[PDB]
Amino acid sequence: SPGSREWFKDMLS
Amino acid sequence: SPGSREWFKDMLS
Amino acid sequence: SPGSREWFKDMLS
Amino acid sequence: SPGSREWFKDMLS
Amino acid sequence: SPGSREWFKDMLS
Amino acid sequence: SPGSREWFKDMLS
Amino acid sequence: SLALSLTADQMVSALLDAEPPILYSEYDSMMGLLTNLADRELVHMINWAKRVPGFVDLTLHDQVHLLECAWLEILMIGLVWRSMEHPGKLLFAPNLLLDRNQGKCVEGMVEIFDMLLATSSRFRMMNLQGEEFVCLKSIILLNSGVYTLEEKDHIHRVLDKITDTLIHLMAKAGLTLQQQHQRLAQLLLILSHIRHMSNKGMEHLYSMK
Amino acid sequence: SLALSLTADQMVSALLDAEPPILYSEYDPTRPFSEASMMGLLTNLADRELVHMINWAKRVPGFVDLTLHDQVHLLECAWLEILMIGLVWRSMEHPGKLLFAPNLLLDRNQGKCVEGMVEIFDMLLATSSRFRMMNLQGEEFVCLKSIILLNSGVYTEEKDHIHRVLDKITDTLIHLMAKAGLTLQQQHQRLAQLLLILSHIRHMSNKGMEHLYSM
Amino acid sequence: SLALSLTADQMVSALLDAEPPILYSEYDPTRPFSEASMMGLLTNLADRELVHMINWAKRVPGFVDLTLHDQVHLLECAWLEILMIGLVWRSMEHPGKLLFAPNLLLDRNQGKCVEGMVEIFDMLLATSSRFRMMNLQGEEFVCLKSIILLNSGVEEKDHIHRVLDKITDTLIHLMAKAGLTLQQQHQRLAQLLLILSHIRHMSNKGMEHLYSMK
Amino acid sequence: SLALSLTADQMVSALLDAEPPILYSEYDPTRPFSEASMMGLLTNLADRELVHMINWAKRVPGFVDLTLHDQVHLLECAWLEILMIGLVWRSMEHPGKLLFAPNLLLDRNQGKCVEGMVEIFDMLLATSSRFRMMNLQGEEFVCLKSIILLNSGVEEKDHIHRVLDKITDTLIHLMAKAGLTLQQQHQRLAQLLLILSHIRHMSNKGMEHLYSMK
Amino acid sequence: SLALSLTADQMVSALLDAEPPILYSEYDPTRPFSEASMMGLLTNLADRELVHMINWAKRVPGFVDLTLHDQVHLLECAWLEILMIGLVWRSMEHPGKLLFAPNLLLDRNQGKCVEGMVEIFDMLLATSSRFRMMNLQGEEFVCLKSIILLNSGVYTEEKDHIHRVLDKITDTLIHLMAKAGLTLQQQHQRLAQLLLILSHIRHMSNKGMEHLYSM
Amino acid sequence: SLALSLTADQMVSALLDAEPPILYSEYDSMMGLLTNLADRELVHMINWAKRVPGFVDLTLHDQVHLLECAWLEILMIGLVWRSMEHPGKLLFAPNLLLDRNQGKCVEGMVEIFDMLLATSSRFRMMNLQGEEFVCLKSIILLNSGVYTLEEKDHIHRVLDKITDTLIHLMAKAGLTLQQQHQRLAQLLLILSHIRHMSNKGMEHLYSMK
Ligand SMILES: CC/C(=C(\c1ccc(O)cc1)c1ccc(OCCN(C)C)cc1)c1ccccc1
Ligand SMILES: CC/C(=C(\c1ccc(O)cc1)c1ccc(OCCN(C)C)cc1)c1ccccc1
Ligand SMILES: CC/C(=C(\c1ccc(O)cc1)c1ccc(OCCN(C)C)cc1)c1ccccc1
Ligand SMILES: CC/C(=C(\c1ccc(O)cc1)c1ccc(OCCN(C)C)cc1)c1ccccc1
Ligand SMILES: CC/C(=C(\c1ccc(O)cc1)c1ccc(OCCN(C)C)cc1)c1ccccc1
Ligand SMILES: CC/C(=C(\c1ccc(O)cc1)c1ccc(OCCN(C)C)cc1)c1ccccc1
Ligand SMILES: [Ca+2]
Ligand SMILES: [Ca+2]
Ligand SMILES: [Ca+2]
Ligand SMILES: [Ca+2]
């Protein structure tokens, strides 16, 4: 979900 | 066909 | 033959 | 459903 | 078919 | 109990 | 030019004097008898035409054209005239009087027969006179092929003379001006029916050749 | 009966008011005529004019008083004559040409496109020429066309009614001519010239029907 | 191009002179309508009108200056809008009815004969009533119909744009000559052109209906 | 009604002040578009814009004078035309592309991602280019968008008609103030309103496309 | 490295230029709030702001120099603090209210719509009040928000880089205050007052995360 | 008011004189030992707070609020300070030194342990001084509950004094003006981490009740 580690990682790369 | 007896009759009544 | 163009021509001259 | 008559009615009243 | 592109083209040329 | 609001109040007056 | 100077009475006289004789049917099929008669009447028609005032002023070409157009109409109006006193019958000749049911002899003729009988009935109802009849027959001769221009102008003046002559006859008989115009119209409309019957007859004749 | 009560001026008005619409033709104007396409074009036009002819006939004084049987008979007999006189009228001011429609003007050479049609064209053209040279008036034209309707089948008491109607149209023609200033002699001469036209119209109709049957 | 040299009076005169004929319908008047027969009649009429539309379009100033390709495109996109504006025009004197032809006047209840058609009839009737209420003139009508043709479908100004500007000038001229104030002229110009949006809409719904029944 | 007492300056000021916010898009920028995801993005955006359209419409002079029924009808008929004119406006500075949002700029080749959509994209791009070529002003844009709302769908003049006349006056005022001659003013008014026909057309094609994919 | 070469004025410009868009909310405005609908509304807004936060973070001087792992870590730690400081900033000129969006302005009583939320609202409101009373400037705000990004996860050589970036933001805050005319004593006092705010922002984020987990 | 008149050197002296003793761990689970210690340190914290200049000027209500907010932060900053010379270990007491792997004794504590160790490492890298430490501990006391207004105005003036005092200490040590501002910022940012760790600790404590 938005704000999670995996979400940030997905969004950042 | 147009102009025949039956056509005139059909068209007139 | 009677009534033909040629016949009329011949009869009228 | 946004844009439907019923949706517009709901949103305006 | 009247009104089609091809019909208009035929009629204009 | 130590660290409670009431305990602090009692200790500070 | 001689024609254009005749009085109405002189025109009537000339037309009456030009009348051909009545022929008897003669034996060489009903069509055979009628053909025999018609071909004999055609010979008399030649000399009749030449005695119609104005006709011989025309060129040979124009005379041939007019007769070629009108001959069957002329035969038919003659037939109708002599059948007038014979209700329901056609008097082809004095010795050849046919009723409607005898017309069925030739495949096709009985359509023509009924039309001729209805026209003869009209003549009877109008009480058509001989002097009027001869005027109509001469109009057919000069009119039927006429639209197809001095020679054709001359024809129109002769046609106007014959109209004058018809009116003279009606006035003399005591018809009012209104009656004269009405009767002139009634008589000329008959020529449309005579054309029709000739066209139908000519169709029949050509198809059996 | 209304028809016999009409004055001559009322008859003219009624006949003028009865006139059918002038019809236009449709065709590809970038495509040359063939025998099939020209005959198809004239057939199409005639068939459409026949529909409008019915509405006109019903407005001709006296026609609607007749029985259905009599109406059918008169129209069945006269229709091609009625088409042809209309054609001749509209061609009057176009020497050498037949104005089938405002957008379909044909000359005699174009008549050769259909086998046997040029002979009919020539007859129609000579009749239109006659009209022009007589200076036929529109009021006379409508009288003549209605005479065709009432006369062409009139032999083949209700028949006495048609004859009184036909007599009224004659009165109407003479009235128009007297109003135009023609002498008595000129009135009877022109009445005859006009009625003799109708024998030629009948002839052309018969030749037309014959041509239609053969194809 | 000659079209762009026309005065307002000459434009009006050219557009009036280009008008196609008013077409009559043919049908057996003793037989009642069916869905098939009514749609059949309207289809036959439209197809005849299309033939005469071609002759009309070629007489609209500017149209023959265009390439064949552009002429075909404008007509292919505009023909139903052009039929509809004509219908709405000839219906003005017949409230509640549509005068398809002088001998074919159909009221709204007759539109229900053809599935879906009554929605179109009601839009056409409202448009006709709007033109009546505005007292649309024949000279204004011919300007609007040519605008439809030229504005059909979807360096500063091409030829079509320049011709459309001349038709605008002509509409304004007509209004000025009738005594309208400048404010009234601009207001009426706007009212008329806004109705063209509704005519586009009705054409789109019509083409939909025609494509779905084919 | 107060709306009909507004001066041209007050109308412009009210319409500028009614403008909705410019919406941003949200997406994973490291994931490529698919048909599903692009249509999904455009659908999400449109649906957000519809919410803000309601607040905008209530601020258009005259709109709240209407009954609830009339308000609903105008919006139901006009909403896609309103989205499209907005899109075309914000795309003017981006030839060959459509600026759906400040962070969502799509070129014509990207429109092919969604079956059928590229025909709509091309119409929208041409309209945007036309507005650019005309140097459409923001004040003119807001007048046109309100015209769309009020002219939506299909005794002398009802309320809507009277308000539309005031917006016409306002457009002409804007043109006059920019120094256009009277002829230029009427020509530009016509050019602008004719483009509304094309916007109607594009909306009809869009609604078709949306209904057929549902 | 660009970040360490920026003058203080360039740092301010870059931080101001990095700012995310102000987001609007969507909801039925004729429908009253419930606990579910209000929490749904704030969740929706936060989730959208998170997307735009990523684009902002990448424009913060120094951030993009870090590894992916470090970027994720700092954002994962700081995001709710970043949302809350932004919320407090935009509420500054609205005493008693929280301006979630320009069309979503809520007071503390509306916070009671969600169980346990009013306590958080009160903390946010006291912080916004503190901002107002300090007359916090937008240039200071952008410095503080970027300090949160770089600091909140900075314990949990590339770490020495972040610390030099953090020192530059401190230099930037002092520059802004000196330019405003504050004395040396007022500059260090205000630097402290501003940085102590960040301990309260951390506290509110922790309380927020706790509330989010419990529901 | 007495607090507001102290020089920087007098503030330092007062803060140093207020320091509580270092306690030894005592036996009545690892959590049991820590709880024992914490509860004993809380008693000393009461008298420490009362010796922080400015604190007893506040109302009883405000004193309770501030301590209720800050106490675990105060314990934690103390823990971090005394663990500074013990890399990788936390010196809870002289007789209770735990490494990171000993933190796994209580489900949940090892998250907290690593944070405390990273903070102690930061203190070591900054070479934090005792005089600086006592300033930070007193800032925690006065700041942590302070946003929730004369009494709160007074607190802000005392907070400003402690800032002045930190700067005085740094200037005295020979840091440049730039270094002083940078170090002040570095030290205050630590208090954000101390808040975080306290919030996490309080969560743990409440959930096991
Ligand atoms: C109506 C009677 C008739 C003819 C006729 C009319 C009047 C008259 O006095 C005498 C006969 C008729 C019959 C045959 C005919 O053939 C001519 C052949 N010749 C010209 C080589 C001509 C007229 C007839 C004509 C066509 C078909 C069938 C019958
Ligand atoms: C002479 C023109 C003409 C027709 C025509 C005349 C006047 C007019 O206004 C329009 C057309 C003509 C052509 C065809 C036709 O009948 C079509 C068959 N239908 C009746 C079933 C009738 C007249 C025609 C007639 C017969 C043969 C060849 C051509
Ligand atoms: C609205 C009337 C109408 C047509 C019409 C409009 C004005 C007019 O003057 C004549 C007709 C209409 C009907 C059918 C039609 O078909 C065209 C088929 N051809 C193009 C193959 C066109 C228009 C129509 C259009 C679409 C659906 C149903 C009816
Ligand atoms: C042309 C762009 C577009 C839409 C759009 C236009 C402008 C804008 O600002 C935003 C979007 C579009 C796309 C989808 C859409 O769905 C509405 C679904 N809701 C109403 C249930 C509406 C407009 C679209 C419309 C129809 C088909 C395909 C694409
Ligand atoms: C205090 C407002 C708030 C949120 C909020 C704060 C600032 C802002 O700009 C927007 C919203 C809030 C609400 C929900 C939320 O998370 C949703 C879950 N996502 C991240 C998966 C985050 C913040 C909230 C946080 C925790 C509990 C209840 C409410
Ligand atoms: C970080 C060590 C610690 C405590 C501690 C910190 C510093 C110090 O000097 C001494 C202890 C801690 C542990 C328990 C505790 O309980 C208080 C219960 N009383 C308040 C009733 C307080 C702090 C602790 C806190 C929360 C959860 C787990 C462990
Ligand atoms: Ca990714
Ligand atoms: Ca019938
Ligand atoms: Ca509602
Ligand atoms: Ca062609």
PDB file of C-alpha atoms in Angstrom, chain K residues 81 123 126-127 130 134 147 151-156 163 166-168 170-171 174 184-185 187-193 195-200 202-204 206-207 210, chain L residues 73 114-115 118-119 122 125 139 143-148 156 159-161 163-164 167 177-178 181-186 188-193 195-197 199-200 203:
ATOM      1  CA  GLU K  81       6.041  13.695   9.325  1.00  0.00           C
ATOM      2  CA  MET K 123      -1.566  18.466  18.532  1.00  0.00           C
ATOM      3  CA  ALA K 126      -1.139  23.633  18.639  1.00  0.00           C
ATOM      4  CA  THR K 127       1.773  23.231  16.204  1.00  0.00           C
ATOM      5  CA  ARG K 130       3.149  27.888  17.242  1.00  0.00           C
ATOM      6  CA  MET K 134       6.709  32.528  15.329  1.00  0.00           C
ATOM      7  CA  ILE K 147      15.593  18.396   7.251  1.00  0.00           C
ATOM      8  CA  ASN K 151      17.182  13.384   9.419  1.00  0.00           C
ATOM      9  CA  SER K 152      14.350  11.156  10.571  1.00  0.00           C
ATOM     10  CA  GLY K 153      15.954   7.908   9.429  1.00  0.00           C
ATOM     11  CA  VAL K 154      19.606   9.090   9.396  1.00  0.00           C
ATOM     12  CA  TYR K 155      20.897   6.784  12.166  1.00  0.00           C
ATOM     13  CA  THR K 156      18.717   3.739  11.369  1.00  0.00           C
ATOM     14  CA  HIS K 163      25.278  15.309   7.408  1.00  0.00           C
ATOM     15  CA  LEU K 166      22.019  18.883   6.745  1.00  0.00           C
ATOM     16  CA  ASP K 167      24.742  21.397   7.820  1.00  0.00           C
ATOM     17  CA  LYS K 168      24.140  23.353   4.585  1.00  0.00           C
ATOM     18  CA  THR K 170      21.400  24.969   8.807  1.00  0.00           C
ATOM     19  CA  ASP K 171      23.657  27.559   7.080  1.00  0.00           C
ATOM     20  CA  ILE K 174      20.809  31.276   9.532  1.00  0.00           C
ATOM     21  CA  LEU K 184      23.185  36.876  16.349  1.00  0.00           C
ATOM     22  CA  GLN K 185      21.354  35.957  19.589  1.00  0.00           C
ATOM     23  CA  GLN K 187      19.352  33.828  15.024  1.00  0.00           C
ATOM     24  CA  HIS K 188      20.507  30.989  17.360  1.00  0.00           C
ATOM     25  CA  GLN K 189      17.352  31.266  19.491  1.00  0.00           C
ATOM     26  CA  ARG K 190      15.067  31.005  16.437  1.00  0.00           C
ATOM     27  CA  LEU K 191      17.159  28.156  14.920  1.00  0.00           C
ATOM     28  CA  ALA K 192      16.599  26.228  18.167  1.00  0.00           C
ATOM     29  CA  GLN K 193      12.833  27.071  18.308  1.00  0.00           C
ATOM     30  CA  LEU K 195      14.390  22.589  15.227  1.00  0.00           C
ATOM     31  CA  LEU K 196      12.498  21.805  18.447  1.00  0.00           C
ATOM     32  CA  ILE K 197       9.278  21.885  16.329  1.00  0.00           C
ATOM     33  CA  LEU K 198      10.632  18.781  14.627  1.00  0.00           C
ATOM     34  CA  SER K 199      10.536  16.787  17.834  1.00  0.00           C
ATOM     35  CA  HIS K 200       6.774  17.558  18.082  1.00  0.00           C
ATOM     36  CA  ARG K 202       7.970  13.293  15.054  1.00  0.00           C
ATOM     37  CA  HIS K 203       5.691  12.766  18.081  1.00  0.00           C
ATOM     38  CA  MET K 204       2.535  13.431  16.044  1.00  0.00           C
ATOM     39  CA  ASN K 206       4.332   8.325  15.788  1.00  0.00           C
ATOM     40  CA  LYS K 207       0.873   8.850  17.289  1.00  0.00           C
ATOM     41  CA  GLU K 210      -0.056   4.029  15.976  1.00  0.00           C
TER      42      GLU K 210
ATOM     43  CA  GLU L  73      12.998  10.613  26.915  1.00  0.00           C
ATOM     44  CA  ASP L 114      19.596  -0.621  17.962  1.00  0.00           C
ATOM     45  CA  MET L 115      18.147   2.883  17.888  1.00  0.00           C
ATOM     46  CA  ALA L 118      22.937   4.360  16.920  1.00  0.00           C
ATOM     47  CA  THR L 119      22.213   7.424  19.049  1.00  0.00           C
ATOM     48  CA  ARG L 122      26.258   9.704  17.149  1.00  0.00           C
ATOM     49  CA  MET L 125      31.141  10.905  16.794  1.00  0.00           C
ATOM     50  CA  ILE L 139      15.472  21.171  26.944  1.00  0.00           C
ATOM     51  CA  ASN L 143       9.996  21.268  25.390  1.00  0.00           C
ATOM     52  CA  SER L 144       8.391  17.848  25.001  1.00  0.00           C
ATOM     53  CA  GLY L 145       4.974  18.765  26.379  1.00  0.00           C
ATOM     54  CA  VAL L 146       5.225  22.526  25.729  1.00  0.00           C
ATOM     55  CA  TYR L 147       3.028  23.170  22.654  1.00  0.00           C
ATOM     56  CA  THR L 148      -0.132  22.041  24.447  1.00  0.00           C
ATOM     57  CA  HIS L 156       9.938  29.695  26.057  1.00  0.00           C
ATOM     58  CA  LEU L 159      14.272  27.493  26.657  1.00  0.00           C
ATOM     59  CA  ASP L 160      15.928  30.494  24.929  1.00  0.00           C
ATOM     60  CA  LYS L 161      18.318  30.761  27.935  1.00  0.00           C
ATOM     61  CA  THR L 163      20.052  27.779  23.844  1.00  0.00           C
ATOM     62  CA  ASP L 164      22.188  30.798  24.814  1.00  0.00           C
ATOM     63  CA  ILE L 167      26.163  28.563  22.315  1.00  0.00           C
ATOM     64  CA  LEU L 177      30.186  31.107  14.650  1.00  0.00           C
ATOM     65  CA  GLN L 178      29.353  28.796  11.706  1.00  0.00           C
ATOM     66  CA  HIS L 181      25.195  27.101  14.596  1.00  0.00           C
ATOM     67  CA  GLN L 182      25.910  23.776  12.836  1.00  0.00           C
ATOM     68  CA  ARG L 183      26.554  21.949  16.110  1.00  0.00           C
ATOM     69  CA  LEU L 184      23.515  23.485  17.831  1.00  0.00           C
ATOM     70  CA  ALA L 185      21.405  22.156  14.936  1.00  0.00           C
ATOM     71  CA  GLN L 186      23.052  18.688  15.075  1.00  0.00           C
ATOM     72  CA  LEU L 188      18.736  19.555  18.594  1.00  0.00           C
ATOM     73  CA  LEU L 189      18.030  17.107  15.770  1.00  0.00           C
ATOM     74  CA  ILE L 190      19.082  14.322  18.181  1.00  0.00           C
ATOM     75  CA  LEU L 191      16.040  15.219  20.302  1.00  0.00           C
ATOM     76  CA  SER L 192      13.786  14.162  17.406  1.00  0.00           C
ATOM     77  CA  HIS L 193      15.397  10.687  17.602  1.00  0.00           C
ATOM     78  CA  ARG L 195      11.315  11.471  21.009  1.00  0.00           C
ATOM     79  CA  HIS L 196      10.976   8.647  18.484  1.00  0.00           C
ATOM     80  CA  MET L 197      12.621   6.102  20.768  1.00  0.00           C
ATOM     81  CA  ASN L 199       7.299   6.911  21.662  1.00  0.00           C
ATOM     82  CA  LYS L 200       8.352   3.390  20.652  1.00  0.00           C
ATOM     83  CA  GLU L 203       4.066   1.806  22.991  1.00  0.00           C
TER      84      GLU L 203
END
